[PDB]
Swiss-Prot record:
Source species, domain of life: Eukaryota
Active site: D133 (proton acceptor)
Protein kinase domain: residues covered: 11-249
UniProt protein name: Focal adhesion kinase 1
Family: Belongs to the protein kinase superfamily. Tyr protein kinase family. FAK subfamily.
Subunit structure: Interacts (via first Pro-rich region) with CAS family members (via SH3 domain), including BCAR1, BCAR3, and CASS4. Interacts with NEDD9 (via SH3 domain). Interacts with GIT1. Interacts with SORBS1. Interacts with ARHGEF28. Interacts with SHB. Part of a complex composed of THSD1, PTK2/FAK1, TLN1 and VCL. Interacts with PXN and TLN1. Interacts with STAT1. Interacts with DCC. Interacts with WASL. Interacts with ARHGEF7. Interacts with GRB2 and GRB7. Component of a complex that contains at least FER, CTTN and PTK2/FAK1. Interacts with BMX. Interacts with TGFB1I1. Interacts with STEAP4.
Lineage: Eukaryota, Metazoa, Chordata, Craniata, Vertebrata
Function as written in the Swiss-Prot or TrEMBL entry: Non-receptor protein-tyrosine kinase that plays an essential role in regulating cell migration, adhesion, spreading, reorganization of the actin cytoskeleton, formation and disassembly of focal adhesions and cell protrusions, cell cycle progression, cell proliferation and apoptosis. Required for early embryonic development and placenta development. Required for embryonic angiogenesis, normal cardiomyocyte migration and proliferation, and normal heart development.
Residues the entry annotates as binding ATP: I17, G18, E19, G20, Q21, F22, G23, K41, E87, L88, C89
Compartments (UniProt record): Cell junction, Focal adhesion; Cell membrane; Cytoplasm, Perinuclear region; Cytoplasm, Cell cortex
Species, as recorded: Homo sapiens (Human)
Free-text note regarding domains: The Pro-rich regions interact with the SH3 domain of CAS family members, such as BCAR1 and NEDD9, and with the GTPase activating protein ARHGAP26.
């Protein structure tokens, strides 16, 4: 909460590195004893307390976590203009990174990002925290072998129970991770491209699933289809996913 208060003069604003829900995201420097590279989330309408509460809720959420593959909260500036200071992931959005590098990223690197993500999600499951929005767009790239989970209606990523009843559980997070894994092996291509959101549920309920991505190991696809069990109680947990992705990665790093 308040132990994360940073005074503004300890922050040098830099160039705009993208956009967020509340305002522009900036690169910048945080000076305090060694002047570190950071991401400054801004909020244009934060003069209104209802917006301010919603915006600073991400800071409140992220304070609770400490993991190598979850974006770190550095601090907050509660006075106007309200800012959220975070760890900078220089390579940006995963979706864009995967697209740009479609012919410059091997299978091993793709499986590695899936593995890394499963470790952040196993950690969140251990804290009994439900993410509700696991998708490639919410993953950031720190380096070419280090991705981070960054965000704290996506019908095409949602488990049927989330669509039908707005139920969000650890099981529904596993479904979304399966979709995210598919997005990674499909080089940032969006799931169900061409299908209307309202027709997705009907396809799922007819047993229809996202196809095997080209060059995807059938063992990795078998893991994804397990995430897409209609019955949430039949889906694996992140602990098992992490362990299986770990073995799949070695099965690739060798041959
Ligand atoms: C946080 C955050 N949002 N966008 C970013 C790029 N690097 N770090 C971040």
């Amino acid at each position: 909460t308040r132990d994360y208060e940073i005074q503004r003069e300890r922050i040098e604003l830099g160039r705009c590195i993208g956009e967020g829900q509340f305002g522009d995201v900036h690169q910048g420097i945080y000076m305090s004893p060694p002047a570190l590279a950071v991401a400054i989330k801004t909020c244009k309408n934060c003069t209104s307390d209802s917006v301010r509460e919603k915006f600073l809720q991400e800071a409140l959420t992220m304070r609770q976590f400490d993991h190598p593959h979850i974006v770190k909260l550095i601090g907050v500036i509660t006075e106007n203009p309200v800012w959220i200071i975070m760890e900078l992931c220089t390579l940006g959005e995963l979706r864009s990174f995967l697209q740009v590098r479609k012919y410059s990223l091997d299978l091993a690197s793709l499986i590695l990002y899936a593995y890394q993500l499963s470790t952040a999600l196993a950690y969140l499951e251990s804290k009994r925290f439900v993410h509700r929005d696991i998708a490639a767009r919410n993953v950031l790239v720190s380096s070419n072998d280090c991705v981070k989970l960054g965000d704290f209606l996506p019908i095409k990523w949602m488990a049927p129970e989330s669509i039908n009843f707005r139920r969000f559980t650890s099981a529904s997070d596993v479904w979304m991770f399966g979709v995210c894994m598919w997005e990674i092996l499909m080089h940032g291509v969006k799931p169900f491209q061409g299908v209307k959101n309202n027709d997705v549920i009907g396809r799922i309920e007819n047993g229809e699933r996202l196809p095997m991505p080209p060059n995807c190991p059938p063992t990795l696809y078998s893991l994804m289809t397990k995430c897409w069990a209609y019955d949430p109680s039949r889906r694996p947990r992140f602990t098992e996913l992490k362990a299986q992705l770990s073995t799949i990665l070695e099965e690739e790093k060798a041959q």
